[PDB]
Structures are given as C-alpha cells and as structure tokens.
Amino acid sequence: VQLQNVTKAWGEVVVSKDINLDIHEGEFVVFVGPSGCGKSTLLRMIAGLETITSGDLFIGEKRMNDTPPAERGVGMVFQSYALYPHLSVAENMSFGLKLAGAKKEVINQRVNQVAEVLQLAHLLDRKPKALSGGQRQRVAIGRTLVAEPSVFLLDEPLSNLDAALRVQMRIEISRLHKRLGRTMIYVTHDQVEAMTLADKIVVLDAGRVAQVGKPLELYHYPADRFVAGFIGSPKMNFLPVKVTATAIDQVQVELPMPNRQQVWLPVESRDVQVGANMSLGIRPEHLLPSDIADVILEGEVQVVEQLGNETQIHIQIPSIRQNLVYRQNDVVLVEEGATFAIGLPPERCHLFREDGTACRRLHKEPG
Amino acid sequence: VQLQNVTKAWGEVVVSKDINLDIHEGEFVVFVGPSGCGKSTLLRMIAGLETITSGDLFIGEKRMNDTPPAERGVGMVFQSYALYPHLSVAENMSFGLKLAGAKKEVINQRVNQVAEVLQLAHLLDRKPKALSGGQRQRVAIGRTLVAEPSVFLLDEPLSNLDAALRVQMRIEISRLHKRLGRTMIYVTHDQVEAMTLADKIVVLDAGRVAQVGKPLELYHYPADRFVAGFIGSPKMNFLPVKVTATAIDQVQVELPMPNRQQVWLPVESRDVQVGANMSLGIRPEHLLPSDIADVILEGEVQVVEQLGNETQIHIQIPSIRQNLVYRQNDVVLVEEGATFAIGLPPERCHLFREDGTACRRLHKEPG
C-alpha cells in the first residue's frame, strides 16, 4: 500500500491535503490524531468507500483509485459492525472468504481456529441476537480474520470491548499480525494500543500529515509543537521562554520563574534568534523530584490525584499562567495549598519556535 | 440516598442480589464492574426506570419503588439523549427549570454555563437537527444538565470525546460537585476517572456488590480475588503458593520456582491452614528491580512493550503457566528470550484463600 499526493475536498472544504504514505508489505501502521484529523476518511479513501479527488493510490502495486471496494484486496471492520441477522455466528465469520473459498475444508478450519482465539468456540451455532454486544463485535472481527485479506483495515475495532478483554484481543491481534505477515492499518485514540502495535505511526492533523515515524521516535523527537502536545496523555508542559544566547548546537533560554534563571539546552540551534520568544516543553514524567536541584521550579498545589500506582500533582507557579503537571511514582502525600518543588532536567527539554517547529533535540535517547 | 436488600430480576432468574448500598449526601459515588455486572440496571432502578422486584430504596428519606420516574427528587441525563429535530436549539437544554424559576435567572445562569468548557458558543441557538457527525450531542445531554435536583445520576458520559474535551470534563464535573454540594452517582469503565472522581466506589460483579470503599482502599485492600483483579490495569499478578506455616500476624508460603523459597507475608492469617493452596498477588507496579536480592523471581523475557514514559516486560516463569508482567519507569532496553530478575516485596503482596477471599494485609499503607 502506497499514497502519492492523495487529496480530497468538496469544492473548497479540504479534508485530505497532499498525503504521501509509503506503507511496506507486512508493516503494522497506526493512524492517530484528533476529532477532525480526518483519519477515518483516509482509511475509507483507501478501501474505495470514499473518492480520491486527486493524486494516486497503489495497492499490491497497481493503481487502485477506480477499483470497486470489493476488488482492492483489503478487508475491514470498525466501531460497531452489524452482523447478518439470519446467519449463525459460524455463518458469519466465514461469510467473506466464502466469497472465493476452498470449500468447507479451509473455511471450516480457519473458522474454529480463529474462533478459539476470540473466545467464541461455544457460540458457533447461535444467532446474532441472543448474543452479547461485545461478542457480536468480536464476531465482526473474526470474519475479516478468517478471510485473511491482503490488507487489513481496522477502525477502532475494540472500542466496544471493556478493559480486561481488550487486552487479550489487543494481543491476539499482534499474534495474528505476526503469523500472517500481511499489512495492517489501524485507527485509534488509545495511545497505548498505538505504541504497542505499530511499527510506524502516522499522526494526522487538519487533514494534513503532521508526522510519521516509529513510536519512540514521535515520543522522544516530536517534529513540532502539535505532535509534542498530541503524543503522551498528561500532556507535555509548555513554558513561554525567551532565548538569551546561541552557540554551535546549544541555545540558552530564560525561564518564566522569578530570579530570571537562564538554562542551556542541547538543541539544534539552527533557525533561532537571540531575543526570540519561544516555547519550552517538558513531560510530566521527566520532571525531577527536586532532591536534584539545578533549576528548580516551585509553586503552590492546585490539584492532586491519587491513581494509586502514581500521583499526578498540578502545581501553580506565579509567572506561569497555566499549571505545571507532575507525575511521581507510588503515593506522595501532599494536600492542596501546600508548596511543592520539582526539578527541570535540561537534556529532556524541548524547544519550539514561534513557527511551532522543533529545534532538533541533540540528547541521544536510548531506543 | 440509600438502598437495602434490593433484589432485581423477574421471578426466579436474578440480576441483582441483595445489595445494601448506603450513599450519604454530598458523596460522589461511582459504579464500576465488568460487562454484565448490572451496574447499569441498578442505576435506572434508582431513577425508577426499572421495577425493583423486592427490597427497599430510600431516596432522600422516603421510599420510592412505586413512586414513578419524573417525581423522584433526582436528575439523570443518560448516555446519549434524544434531541428535538423541530425545536431549534433556542428550545433545547431546559424544559426543566423553564415553567418556573425567576424570569431570566434560570436559563442565563444555571442553563447558560455548561456550554462553557466545550467550545460551545457556536451552537447557542442554531437548530441542531442534522448538523454534524457529533454536534447535536451538546444539544442532547445538557437538556437537563441544570436543575440542581437532590441527587444526580449519570452513565458513561464523556466516551466519544478524544483525550481532549473529556479530561477537562473530569475537571469540570468535579468542579460542579464543589459549587453544587449535591449528591451524584457516576457510572463508567474509565478507571482513572472513577479513581479521580469518587469519594466512595462500589464494585459490582454479576449483580453482586463485590465491595465498597474509597479509591486507595480498593487498591490497597481488595476484599477478594475479583476486586484485586478488576481495579488496576495491567491486572495484578497471581502466583500459586502453598502455605507452609502460620502465626498470629504472619502466614508463610512457598514460592513455585525451584529451590522452593519460603516467605513470611504480613497478613490476616485468620482462616488459613497449613498445606492449603492459596494465591499470592503482587501488582506489576510493585515488583522491584532485583538489585534488592531478598526473595527474587527470574525468567525469560517474552513481551517487552515500550510506552515511552515506562516499559512493560512480560516474564515467563518456570512452573507458572501464565507470564508475569512488570512495570518499570523510563526506557529499559531488553530483548526477548533474555533472562530477567525482579524483586518480590512481602509488604506489598496479597493472599487469597480458595474462597478467593483476601487475607487482610496487616501493613498500613500511607494514604
């Protein structure tokens, strides 16, 4: 699967601008982004269920822009797929692949096989009705699974399933993905899942492609502020700062804290001017405990949540409008109003220009 | 609010055993549990929507089993509300707090306030009927989001809103619980949410009230196997162990691995006999990094999930069917098939009899 200049609009309303994705055979790619990143359309644009008003689309190799959906070699499942009311569970799950199958021999084999793996063995001879809504969805998945299509299109397939089932299926997915080394494209909002399944994640924004790379690549090296703010749940912290000096691959910034402290960051230094107001990023998880000074940020506690395995502390700081979110392991016992101190590790700070573009971090991160 | 021996079913096949909840006022209470635990039904059963085939229900102070819906003294804006295609948005999010209430201090202060932290302001009055693939939601639920009844009753609200207009809600609903010192009954599958919103949590399993208490009390002192395995994800690790000795504030067990190491655990010891086959539980976040050699577990790395802020390692252990997940902060690079060693802390372990009943931990957890 490959895309070259793919574009789509409705007169002027654009929802897919110049996208070029080069998906290699066997790769498990994951599409992420917010509300209208248009990540679903694009999945649909690939299956044919949506028109491509420009550019090219190849699958297998041959151009596919005008190939009816059922002939592209792709398979699909999404949110709450509807099964065939009259067909039994076993009848479903086999529907596809039946549509060109080596008779009961193969069908009645991939079925029961893929059945066990989805904890459905004891439902084979039943109807879509008198069946849990969580099992129905698993059935929907099964079909695509026994068909072993050339390319799997998955759109938040486990959305239905509840925590403590979605983990089992999130695993069966990879297992299957490994056995049948066929290409797979997945869409979600569950960032763990993404980081867990993907070989490559494509982050979408405004219909455009914000960035593509391996999981730990987008995490340690966001290409811009949008991606920095998008990958990672207790969103990265951004502190307005002013640059006070630049040297070969260095660049010094003046923090918002009183005593106007200056800190040198190991970053690209390319398109950065002395006096330019830029942004600094620091993930809640990378903020130091304070027992390690060297640039300390102090403020007053606003919120405090006990997750039981960790503790997120919302800290306010005069000369920092927005709060600073912090993550510390286990149980820290601090009440609201109390005063809290944390540390700022320079080798883990990001620096974005007004442009919003990142100043290539130079700290070699493992992995 | 409060319940007693409430039994729900139809005439024989139960769907809600003798539950005896007791919800003081001003208390934010969350219901959690797997799929068909019935946590939902019970919700409706409180708001009348369901016939309580037994028991009693004291909303406020007066029984209300027979007392029809509307007239109850509650609130409750279910999952996805049904708008009014005809009545423009100038005729939405009200009805209640309309036929009465001082002139303009009803739909100006109370009503007009929720469309605040949802970007809402573009839908002030514009007819919702066939707007966007998710714009009539704002003009569906909030239809009764303000009347300040005696007790609220929600059900899996913020679910189709990305890690955006949902996190803020967990910041707003809890805010309303500040001003409106009223009572609420939230229901979800978002464990962080539950843990971050409730003052008290009831965990239901097959219409059975598994246990009730504060967040950290369910995390630190689960009443039994069910609850220890349900709160927290990844799930708690469980190992089969045989009890070799007992005292009046200990209980000794024999780990599975070779050299059958024995360890004394700080637990109840009440109903436990030498020889019994019990289950030891230790949370992945609590396993230790082996440089602390007092009772170690060693195995071959199977899975290694890199989440960016942490790293999860699945370790296959000899003479223990299932693997053993381990959570560690940061990167930690480890290839599969490798040999890994972790620390197993006696304070942090749990112990369950065949009953699945937990042997009360005697160590006091701070918090």
XYZ file of C-alpha atoms in Angstrom:
734
model
C 0.000 0.000 0.000
C 1.186 3.477 -1.037
C -0.162 7.035 -1.476
C 1.172 9.820 -3.679
C -0.247 13.335 -3.385
C -3.622 11.895 -2.319
C -6.144 14.705 -1.881
C -9.835 15.150 -1.223
C -12.174 18.067 -0.974
C -15.756 19.046 -1.514
C -15.398 22.130 -3.692
C -13.208 24.062 -1.251
C -13.695 22.216 2.046
C -10.476 20.174 2.179
C -10.205 17.062 4.347
C -7.077 15.340 2.962
C -4.206 17.505 1.672
C -1.164 16.166 -0.198
C -0.683 12.970 1.744
C 2.182 10.653 0.847
C 2.331 7.473 2.891
C 4.655 4.641 1.883
C 3.422 1.521 3.702
C 5.633 -1.549 3.174
C 4.321 -5.076 2.926
C 3.934 -6.547 6.387
C 4.040 -3.268 8.276
C 1.553 -2.587 11.060
C 0.762 1.135 10.606
C -1.316 3.197 13.058
C -3.242 6.417 12.327
C -3.674 8.839 15.223
C -4.864 12.404 15.596
C -7.770 14.488 16.999
C -11.538 14.772 16.269
C -11.376 16.011 12.689
C -7.877 14.979 11.723
C -9.895 13.116 9.141
C -8.081 9.908 9.945
C -11.217 7.832 9.289
C -11.956 9.256 5.861
C -8.415 8.410 4.780
C -8.847 4.831 5.930
C -12.078 4.842 3.906
C -10.438 6.568 0.959
C -8.156 3.537 0.791
C -10.939 0.946 0.753
C -12.791 2.787 -2.004
C -15.715 3.715 0.246
C -14.693 7.324 -0.401
C -13.458 9.055 -3.547
C -9.943 10.388 -4.074
C -10.232 13.729 -5.913
C -6.514 13.870 -6.796
C -3.177 12.065 -6.644
C -2.555 8.321 -6.834
C -3.211 5.221 -4.702
C -1.490 1.899 -5.211
C -2.170 -1.439 -3.548
C -0.247 -4.579 -4.273
C 1.405 -2.274 -6.805
C -1.310 -1.438 -9.322
C -3.151 1.904 -9.246
C -6.469 1.442 -7.386
C -8.243 4.819 -7.440
C -11.090 3.403 -9.538
C -11.335 -0.181 -8.344
C -14.641 -1.167 -6.742
C -14.163 -1.671 -2.942
C -14.625 -5.445 -3.098
C -11.759 -5.863 -5.565
C -8.916 -3.943 -3.867
C -7.742 -6.876 -1.765
C -8.474 -5.155 1.510
C -10.618 -6.245 4.434
C -12.400 -4.049 7.005
C -14.020 -3.767 10.438
C -14.931 -0.766 12.575
C -16.582 0.513 15.748
C -19.858 -1.401 15.906
C -20.096 -3.619 12.808
C -23.531 -5.128 12.104
C -23.723 -8.904 11.574
C -26.192 -10.718 9.280
C -29.373 -11.234 11.420
C -30.346 -14.567 9.847
C -26.903 -16.147 9.567
C -25.486 -18.053 12.545
C -22.278 -16.927 14.237
C -20.435 -19.621 12.293
C -22.241 -18.430 9.147
C -20.770 -15.034 9.888
C -17.008 -15.009 10.358
C -16.961 -17.150 7.224
C -19.095 -15.067 5.029
C -16.068 -13.441 3.479
C -13.520 -15.920 2.180
C -16.575 -17.951 1.387
C -16.778 -15.391 -1.351
C -13.971 -17.364 -3.030
C -13.106 -20.341 -0.723
C -11.530 -23.828 -0.969
C -14.806 -25.243 0.391
C -15.536 -26.402 3.954
C -12.013 -27.847 4.120
C -10.317 -24.461 4.534
C -13.295 -22.379 5.734
C -14.333 -24.854 8.425
C -10.816 -24.719 9.891
C -9.856 -21.044 9.851
C -13.245 -20.590 11.454
C -12.938 -22.782 14.573
C -9.280 -21.824 14.762
C -9.908 -18.074 14.744
C -12.939 -18.835 16.911
C -10.995 -20.174 19.877
C -8.588 -17.233 19.702
C -11.549 -14.884 20.077
C -13.224 -16.901 22.834
C -16.160 -17.764 20.578
C -15.944 -21.552 20.252
C -19.202 -22.004 22.242
C -21.234 -19.614 20.045
C -20.569 -21.096 16.631
C -24.111 -22.406 16.227
C -26.057 -19.400 17.546
C -27.697 -16.223 16.181
C -26.509 -12.584 16.248
C -29.404 -11.887 18.533
C -29.326 -13.659 21.899
C -25.622 -12.745 21.848
C -23.744 -10.126 23.865
C -22.982 -6.863 22.099
C -19.350 -7.438 22.978
C -19.371 -10.860 21.359
C -21.104 -9.604 18.231
C -18.223 -7.173 17.670
C -15.708 -9.955 18.201
C -17.594 -11.940 15.580
C -17.371 -8.998 13.169
C -13.639 -9.102 13.683
C -13.462 -12.860 13.132
C -14.795 -12.683 9.551
C -12.026 -10.354 8.394
C -9.698 -12.685 10.278
C -10.651 -15.951 8.576
C -10.655 -14.214 5.198
C -7.011 -13.298 5.661
C -7.318 -10.412 3.211
C -4.264 -8.972 1.503
C -4.558 -5.816 3.651
C -6.494 -5.296 6.924
C -8.309 -2.000 7.529
C -9.173 -1.588 11.196
C -11.040 1.338 12.665
C -11.111 1.270 16.460
C -12.247 -2.424 16.370
C -12.105 -2.984 20.124
C -13.944 0.194 21.066
C -16.822 -1.990 22.238
C -14.826 -4.393 24.438
C -14.110 -3.434 28.050
C -10.778 -3.220 29.836
C -9.931 -6.816 30.600
C -10.852 -8.280 27.258
C -9.434 -5.560 25.071
C -6.007 -6.580 26.357
C -6.498 -10.168 25.282
C -7.735 -9.064 21.824
C -5.033 -6.391 21.557
C -2.642 -9.315 21.913
C -4.417 -11.774 19.643
C -4.207 -9.016 17.046
C -0.421 -8.880 17.137
C -0.179 -12.680 17.231
C -2.270 -12.857 14.077
C -0.321 -9.950 12.623
C 2.888 -11.957 13.090
C 1.669 -15.312 11.765
C 0.013 -13.832 8.679
C 2.693 -11.276 7.911
C 0.124 -9.283 5.920
C -0.066 -5.478 6.035
C -2.426 -3.897 8.611
C -3.710 -0.340 9.059
C -5.277 0.594 12.393
C -7.089 3.744 13.642
C -7.440 4.804 17.329
C -7.357 7.248 20.182
C -5.973 4.708 22.636
C -2.330 5.839 22.533
C -1.051 2.822 24.482
C -2.504 0.496 21.828
C -0.837 2.517 19.117
C 2.559 2.476 20.811
C 2.055 -1.220 21.469
C 1.001 -2.444 17.972
C 2.581 -0.023 15.488
C 5.876 -0.332 13.661
C 5.117 3.079 12.350
C 2.624 5.686 13.497
C 1.306 8.447 11.308
C -0.011 11.447 13.216
C -2.697 13.376 11.383
C -3.816 16.971 11.845
C -6.291 19.172 9.968
C -6.355 16.510 7.257
C -2.648 17.018 6.732
C 0.121 14.707 7.844
C 1.843 16.101 10.909
C 4.474 13.358 11.180
C 5.401 9.719 10.569
C 7.900 7.592 12.466
C 8.266 4.721 14.943
C 6.538 5.034 18.338
C 9.573 6.031 20.422
C 10.516 8.373 17.576
C 7.418 10.532 17.921
C 7.731 10.388 21.659
C 11.338 11.450 22.041
C 11.519 13.610 18.940
C 8.302 15.404 18.046
C 8.809 17.308 14.806
C 6.690 20.227 16.056
C 4.524 21.571 18.894
C 1.351 19.960 17.642
C 2.816 16.455 17.815
C 4.609 17.235 21.110
C 1.250 18.206 22.559
C -0.509 15.234 20.952
C 1.582 12.161 21.874
C 1.560 11.444 25.659
C -1.530 11.667 27.950
C -0.817 14.097 30.879
C 0.017 16.495 28.004
C 3.530 17.921 27.806
C 4.097 21.182 29.656
C 4.885 24.313 27.694
C 6.532 27.311 29.386
C 6.946 30.574 27.490
C 10.647 31.437 27.388
C 12.963 33.967 25.728
C 16.271 32.939 24.116
C 19.343 34.691 25.537
C 22.209 33.048 23.666
C 23.134 30.609 20.917
C 26.269 28.680 20.172
C 27.049 25.721 17.978
C 24.243 23.284 18.890
C 23.286 24.884 22.224
C 20.874 27.808 22.638
C 20.188 29.334 26.074
C 16.706 30.300 27.332
C 15.490 32.482 30.231
C 12.769 30.804 32.293
C 9.453 32.399 33.482
C 10.400 31.849 37.110
C 11.472 34.856 39.204
C 15.220 35.327 39.572
C 15.030 35.017 35.756
C 17.204 31.917 35.603
C 18.972 31.028 32.377
C 19.483 27.421 31.197
C 21.454 25.944 28.295
C 19.600 23.272 26.292
C 21.276 20.793 23.935
C 19.228 21.593 20.817
C 19.770 22.107 17.060
C 20.223 25.925 17.321
C 19.540 26.341 13.593
C 16.814 28.900 12.969
C 16.859 30.634 16.344
C 17.480 34.325 17.091
C 18.744 35.907 20.291
C 15.706 37.638 21.761
C 13.145 35.400 20.067
C 10.273 34.318 22.305
C 9.947 30.562 22.060
C 8.320 27.679 23.834
C 9.842 25.077 26.143
C 8.429 21.614 26.657
C 8.848 19.143 29.472
C 6.830 15.989 30.003
C 5.290 15.460 33.420
C 7.206 12.171 33.737
C 10.602 13.890 33.118
C 10.311 16.493 35.855
C 12.839 15.754 38.583
C 11.892 15.105 42.261
C 13.746 18.258 43.467
C 16.292 16.306 45.517
C 18.232 17.135 42.356
C 18.332 20.899 42.043
C 19.876 22.627 39.058
C 16.938 24.744 38.037
C 14.093 24.242 40.492
C 10.501 25.261 39.930
C 8.402 25.984 42.978
C 4.757 26.905 43.257
C 1.561 26.063 45.099
C -0.506 22.882 44.704
C -3.856 23.161 42.891
C -4.952 19.619 42.153
C -3.740 16.268 43.477
C -4.952 12.926 42.153
C -4.223 9.578 43.766
C -4.113 6.994 40.989
C -2.662 4.531 43.469
C 0.225 3.473 41.258
C 1.385 7.036 40.755
C 0.462 10.556 41.784
C -0.155 13.455 39.465
C 0.382 16.853 41.037
C -0.969 20.028 39.460
C 1.283 22.874 40.554
C 0.609 26.558 40.015
C 3.510 28.974 39.632
C 3.412 32.794 39.702
C 4.717 33.875 36.322
C 3.224 30.826 34.642
C -0.459 31.241 33.854
C -1.181 27.539 33.317
C -0.442 24.863 35.905
C 2.548 22.547 35.745
C 1.569 18.867 35.782
C 3.918 16.448 37.547
C 3.976 12.629 37.779
C 5.625 10.800 40.638
C 5.508 7.133 41.370
C 3.511 5.497 44.132
C 1.956 7.624 46.841
C 3.106 11.084 47.656
C 1.019 12.606 50.422
C 0.572 16.285 49.704
C -2.542 18.363 50.351
C -3.830 21.226 48.199
C -2.359 24.604 49.037
C 0.865 23.028 50.250
C 4.028 24.237 48.498
C 5.759 21.832 46.084
C 9.158 21.800 44.397
C 10.350 19.927 41.316
C 13.409 19.838 39.082
C 13.966 20.751 35.423
C 16.275 18.353 33.517
C 17.891 20.251 30.640
C 18.673 17.191 28.460
C 14.987 16.423 28.339
C 13.545 19.800 27.406
C 12.029 20.568 24.029
C 12.294 23.960 22.269
C 9.759 25.163 19.653
C 9.980 28.403 17.650
C 7.093 30.818 17.063
C 6.906 28.812 13.835
C 5.897 25.995 16.168
C 8.674 23.869 14.718
C 11.028 21.871 16.954
C 14.740 22.627 17.447
C 16.142 19.124 16.917
C 16.977 17.741 20.355
C 20.590 16.550 20.451
C 20.350 14.361 23.516
C 20.789 10.800 22.293
C 17.844 8.974 23.924
C 18.058 5.185 24.240
C 15.865 3.062 21.951
C -29.722 8.218 49.046
C -29.626 4.595 50.216
C -30.687 1.023 49.429
C -31.400 -2.242 51.245
C -31.778 -5.888 50.205
C -32.788 -4.576 46.790
C -33.381 -7.608 44.583
C -33.978 -7.221 40.863
C -34.940 -9.913 38.378
C -38.255 -11.135 37.015
C -39.409 -14.111 39.057
C -36.550 -16.553 39.550
C -33.514 -15.699 37.434
C -31.781 -12.945 39.444
C -29.821 -9.992 38.008
C -29.245 -8.170 41.287
C -28.670 -9.975 44.560
C -29.396 -8.476 47.981
C -27.424 -5.246 47.544
C -27.352 -2.882 50.528
C -25.704 0.322 49.331
C -25.742 3.395 51.556
C -24.957 6.734 49.895
C -24.584 9.680 52.287
C -25.354 13.104 50.825
C -22.685 15.240 49.167
C -20.900 11.993 48.328
C -19.726 11.424 44.774
C -20.250 7.698 44.187
C -19.038 5.710 41.182
C -20.202 2.314 39.977
C -17.731 0.028 38.234
C -17.615 -3.613 37.225
C -17.175 -5.763 34.110
C -19.747 -6.118 31.307
C -22.972 -7.503 32.741
C -22.264 -6.834 36.395
C -25.562 -4.985 36.256
C -24.050 -1.733 37.488
C -26.220 -0.024 34.842
C -29.594 -1.588 35.625
C -29.197 -0.626 39.283
C -28.708 2.948 38.091
C -32.092 3.015 36.356
C -33.650 1.065 39.232
C -32.794 4.134 41.378
C -34.395 6.564 38.915
C -37.483 4.376 38.611
C -36.740 3.218 35.047
C -36.775 -0.338 36.431
C -39.134 -2.280 38.666
C -37.373 -3.262 41.884
C -38.679 -6.823 42.343
C -38.123 -6.682 46.145
C -36.120 -4.707 48.712
C -36.440 -1.007 49.540
C -34.969 2.283 48.205
C -34.790 5.416 50.381
C -34.006 8.350 48.074
C -33.515 11.295 50.395
C -35.737 9.928 53.156
C -38.864 8.476 51.574
C -39.174 5.074 49.900
C -39.727 5.380 46.139
C -40.088 1.967 44.478
C -43.646 2.643 43.299
C -43.174 6.423 43.101
C -42.984 6.892 39.287
C -39.954 8.452 37.452
C -40.163 12.256 36.974
C -41.487 12.634 40.505
C -38.496 11.264 42.411
C -36.266 14.105 43.602
C -33.390 13.114 41.334
C -31.961 14.227 37.999
C -30.178 11.924 35.459
C -29.083 12.566 31.812
C -28.246 9.120 30.380
C -25.568 8.224 27.797
C -26.953 9.778 24.577
C -30.084 11.903 24.901
C -32.668 12.278 22.110
C -32.931 15.860 20.845
C -35.863 17.622 19.212
C -35.279 17.865 15.412
C -38.006 20.523 15.246
C -37.473 22.802 18.270
C -34.394 24.895 17.394
C -31.507 24.972 19.875
C -33.220 28.051 21.359
C -35.643 25.367 22.576
C -33.099 22.865 23.991
C -31.226 22.107 27.225
C -34.143 23.119 29.519
C -37.835 22.107 29.856
C -36.862 21.596 33.433
C -36.146 24.911 35.049
C -38.428 26.538 32.479
C -42.121 26.526 33.564
C -40.860 28.161 36.784
C -37.731 29.844 38.151
C -37.244 33.609 38.438
C -37.583 35.115 34.921
C -34.048 35.261 33.434
C -32.045 33.737 36.326
C -32.909 30.228 35.119
C -31.639 29.824 31.553
C -28.991 32.550 31.848
C -27.010 31.433 34.909
C -27.970 27.800 35.554
C -28.562 26.751 31.911
C -26.080 29.023 30.122
C -22.898 27.843 31.846
C -22.346 24.234 30.711
C -21.743 25.202 27.068
C -18.648 26.838 28.546
C -15.862 24.237 28.669
C -16.868 22.518 25.403
C -16.019 25.291 22.912
C -19.807 25.685 22.865
C -20.920 29.161 21.781
C -21.269 28.390 18.068
C -24.434 26.409 18.812
C -26.097 28.923 21.170
C -29.469 28.574 19.357
C -28.878 27.186 15.811
C -31.211 24.255 15.080
C -29.274 21.025 15.804
C -31.451 18.874 13.527
C -28.937 17.294 11.134
C -25.864 19.449 11.882
C -22.619 17.442 12.166
C -21.393 13.937 12.957
C -21.393 14.959 16.594
C -22.769 18.471 17.128
C -26.268 17.532 18.330
C -24.623 15.880 21.351
C -24.205 19.292 23.021
C -27.929 19.866 22.424
C -28.936 16.381 23.609
C -27.468 15.639 27.060
C -27.345 19.098 28.652
C -31.129 19.160 28.136
C -31.414 18.693 31.902
C -27.796 19.381 32.910
C -29.115 22.095 35.232
C -31.969 21.909 37.750
C -29.813 21.162 40.805
C -32.024 18.282 41.960
C -31.301 16.428 45.199
C -29.181 13.762 43.510
C -27.699 13.365 40.007
C -27.428 10.134 38.015
C -25.046 9.874 35.044
C -23.927 6.926 32.904
C -20.736 6.665 30.812
C -20.886 10.296 29.580
C -17.606 11.555 28.087
C -16.858 8.468 25.966
C -16.751 9.514 22.302
C -14.629 12.594 23.001
C -10.878 12.144 22.457
C -8.298 12.809 25.199
C -9.418 16.425 24.835
C -12.946 17.562 25.764
C -13.020 14.681 28.256
C -10.074 15.404 30.546
C -11.435 18.917 31.089
C -14.829 17.410 31.958
C -13.191 15.314 34.680
C -12.003 18.775 35.741
C -15.453 20.366 35.412
C -17.918 17.751 36.659
C -15.787 17.585 39.804
C -15.909 21.398 39.853
C -19.703 21.401 39.781
C -19.522 18.944 42.696
C -17.817 21.829 44.523
C -20.438 24.536 43.928
C -23.373 22.147 43.758
C -22.586 20.399 47.034
C -25.267 17.995 45.871
C -25.071 14.216 45.510
C -24.079 12.341 42.329
C -23.906 8.752 41.067
C -21.460 8.428 38.183
C -21.015 5.160 36.247
C -18.081 4.189 33.983
C -15.265 1.981 32.774
C -12.731 4.754 32.871
C -10.867 3.611 35.995
C -8.672 6.674 36.217
C -11.877 8.733 36.124
C -13.647 6.686 38.776
C -10.485 6.798 40.931
C -10.246 10.543 40.342
C -13.897 11.487 40.873
C -15.432 9.328 43.600
C -15.265 9.731 47.359
C -16.577 6.202 47.507
C -16.612 3.360 44.945
C -18.837 0.323 44.717
C -17.582 -2.537 42.587
C -20.266 -4.863 41.311
C -19.890 -8.381 39.880
C -22.892 -10.285 38.483
C -25.369 -8.051 40.284
C -23.326 -8.731 43.407
C -21.755 -5.879 45.370
C -18.130 -7.028 45.451
C -17.026 -4.324 47.880
C -17.350 -0.629 48.680
C -14.857 1.894 49.960
C -12.531 4.717 48.944
C -10.272 4.526 45.838
C -6.991 3.668 47.602
C -8.820 1.264 49.856
C -9.817 -0.866 46.885
C -6.325 -0.593 45.503
C -4.567 -1.430 48.754
C -7.040 -3.702 50.473
C -9.239 -5.514 47.952
C -11.800 -7.680 49.689
C -11.122 -10.581 47.329
C -9.676 -12.018 44.132
C -12.328 -10.398 41.936
C -11.722 -6.856 43.204
C -7.903 -7.288 43.329
C -8.022 -8.389 39.696
C -10.514 -5.757 38.495
C -9.033 -2.492 39.834
C -5.796 -1.689 38.074
C -4.564 -2.423 34.587
C -2.469 -4.282 33.719
C -4.073 -6.742 36.090
C -2.498 -7.832 39.368
C -0.078 -10.726 39.059
C -1.163 -14.017 40.706
C 1.038 -16.963 41.671
C 0.090 -20.334 43.126
C 1.741 -20.880 46.511
C 1.391 -23.436 49.278
C 1.211 -22.262 52.882
C 3.976 -23.832 54.975
C 3.426 -22.195 58.380
C 1.243 -19.718 60.338
C 1.477 -17.352 63.299
C -0.779 -14.656 64.780
C 0.397 -11.938 62.383
C 2.232 -13.664 59.514
C 1.471 -16.752 57.407
C 4.333 -18.329 55.480
C 4.075 -19.512 51.850
C 6.315 -21.407 49.427
C 7.034 -19.786 46.052
C 6.636 -22.022 42.955
C 10.122 -21.784 41.387
C 12.897 -24.298 42.117
C 14.732 -24.062 45.444
C 11.157 -23.592 46.709
C 11.805 -20.383 48.650
C 9.588 -19.718 51.634
C 8.480 -16.196 52.578
C 6.521 -14.783 55.520
C 3.759 -12.407 54.450
C 2.213 -9.718 56.721
C -1.390 -10.934 56.513
C -4.563 -11.795 58.419
C -3.716 -15.477 58.959
C -7.306 -15.852 60.212
C -8.922 -18.721 58.319
C -5.763 -20.247 56.867
C -4.407 -23.766 57.298
C -1.001 -25.249 56.687
C -0.938 -27.114 53.408
C -3.681 -25.069 51.764
C -3.107 -23.909 48.176
C -3.534 -20.171 48.116
C -2.960 -17.379 45.633
C -0.346 -14.689 46.102
C -0.842 -11.416 44.300
C 1.668 -8.707 43.635
C 0.981 -5.664 41.436
C 3.257 -5.070 38.415
C 3.963 -1.528 39.667
C 5.142 -3.065 42.979
C 7.612 -5.655 41.726
C 11.133 -4.442 42.481
C 14.302 -4.103 40.384
C 16.179 -7.155 41.746
C 19.264 -5.202 42.964
C 17.350 -5.916 46.263
C 18.009 -9.722 46.499
C 15.596 -10.649 49.382
C 13.427 -13.203 47.508
C 13.840 -12.979 43.727
C 11.896 -14.218 40.693
C 13.779 -14.934 37.460
C 12.543 -15.688 33.950
C 12.790 -15.353 30.185
C 11.539 -12.163 28.624
C 8.558 -12.844 26.389
C 6.971 -9.455 25.727
C 8.537 -6.007 26.060
C 6.161 -3.089 25.472
C 7.777 0.376 25.314
C 5.260 3.084 26.261
C 7.713 5.968 26.351
C 7.245 7.015 29.944
C 7.584 3.414 31.057
C 8.307 -0.088 29.959
C 6.347 -3.253 30.460
C 8.088 -6.619 30.434
C 6.305 -9.944 30.301
C 8.385 -12.600 32.012
C 7.648 -16.279 31.547
C 8.388 -18.128 34.763
C 9.183 -21.836 35.103
C 6.359 -23.659 36.875
C 3.797 -20.868 36.425
C 1.517 -21.260 33.438
C 0.924 -17.569 32.688
C 3.576 -14.875 32.371
C 4.376 -12.179 34.913
C 4.038 -8.528 33.852
C 6.421 -5.935 35.268
C 6.127 -2.155 35.022
C 9.274 -0.043 35.082
C 9.759 3.683 34.600
C 11.508 5.111 31.534
C 13.143 3.081 28.721
C 14.918 -0.127 29.874
C 16.072 -1.965 26.758
C 15.595 -5.737 26.860
C 15.384 -8.237 24.003
C 13.030 -11.232 24.142
C 14.348 -14.596 25.267
C 16.563 -12.748 27.771
C 16.870 -13.679 31.427
C 15.343 -11.119 33.787
C 15.164 -10.882 37.564
C 12.796 -8.911 39.783
C 12.153 -8.319 43.467
C 9.035 -9.561 45.253
C 8.299 -7.380 48.402
C 6.489 -9.111 51.267
C 4.667 -5.946 52.454
C 3.037 -5.375 49.098
C 1.785 -8.928 48.474
C -1.814 -10.111 48.803
C -3.036 -13.587 49.685
C -6.294 -15.291 48.827
C -7.806 -18.464 50.236
C -9.556 -20.876 47.836
C -12.617 -18.754 48.648
C -10.962 -16.050 46.602
C -11.275 -14.134 49.878
C -8.376 -11.886 50.678
C -6.334 -12.329 53.820
C -6.288 -8.833 55.285
C -2.896 -7.146 54.869
C -1.503 -6.043 58.278
C 0.904 -3.446 56.865
C -0.568 0.063 56.864
C -0.215 1.846 53.537
C 0.341 5.593 53.798
C -2.744 7.356 52.427
